[PDB]
């Protein structure tokens, strides 16, 4: 996370670290959406252009953590995967369209004071909360510069409007992605960066006191570049498919 700050422990429970078995290595972010299901970006698993293609027997997940390195023995939970479901129409060749994935846990998870899911978006919430200017939040252990935090980081970024996102890149943008970030004249900074990928962009709803997962960190042209915004997967819209895998 570029231009963020340390998070208060217990800030983001639904924050999984997508780690690799050997040699140990962080690959991305993901989130807890249940006690057996994890959501992440598909490019974290399959991205052919870089020879990247992971199997269930290549990863682990360290659910519920704070210090990126010091394995906090009696508060954190490691787990192996059972399955990996990657959207079947995920465009990795062109624009990273539908860059979503659902990771199954070998066996369930003992929710704790530092582990618990994040709410998925329902039609009603999505409608009232997805408006430009409306800020959501990103957490992650990835680089703080285009160099890595000792603790989880946070940055709260505004949803930019559809036309401005499209005007900044030359990438065909789809219904399934939105962007967030500050525009050049705001003199406020922030962005996700390498390794924050797959992490969650959550927004809090005023009606009840719940946090919803609005989007999955996907791509960007650098990290915290002026006149460039960060793209996130539109969870609500791919939620139809989410139901299909968890069923």
């Amino acid at each position: 996370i570029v231009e963020g700050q340390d998070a208060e422990v217990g800030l983001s429970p639904w924050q999984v670290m997508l780690f690799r078995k050997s040699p140990q290595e962080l690959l991305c972010g993901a989130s807890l959406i249940s006690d057996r299901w994890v959501l992440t970006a598909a490019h974290c698993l399959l991205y052919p252009p870089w020879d990247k293609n992971f199997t269930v027997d290549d990863l682990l997940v360290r659910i519920g953590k704070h210090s990126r390195t010091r394995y906090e023995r009696k508060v954190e939970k490691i787990s192996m995967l059972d399955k990996i479901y990657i959207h079947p129409r995920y465009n990795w060749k062109e624009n990273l369209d539908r860059d979503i994935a659902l990771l199954k846990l070998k066996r369930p998870i003992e929710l704790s004071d530092y582990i618990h899911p994040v709410c998925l978006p329902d039609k009603q919430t999505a409608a009232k909360l997805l408006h430009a200017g409306f800020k959501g939040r990103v957490t992650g252990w990835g680089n703080r510069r285009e160099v890595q935090p000792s603790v989880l980081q946070v940055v709260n970024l505004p949803l930019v409007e559809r036309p401005v996102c499209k005007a900044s890149t030359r990438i065909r943008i789809t219904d399934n992605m939105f962007c967030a970030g500050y525009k050049p004249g705001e003199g406020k900074r922030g962005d996700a960066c390498e390794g924050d990928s797959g992490g969650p962009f959550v927004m809090k709803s005023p009606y009840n006191n719940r946090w919803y997962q609005m989007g999955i960190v996907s791509w960007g042209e650098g990290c915290d570049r002026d006149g460039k915004y960060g793209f996130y997967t539109h969870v609500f819209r791919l939620k139809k498919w989410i139901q299909k895998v968890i069923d």
Partner: peptide, 6 residues
């Protein structure tokens, strides 16, 4: 097709 991976 930047993939925010590490």
């Amino acid at each position: 097709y930047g993939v925010r991976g590490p």
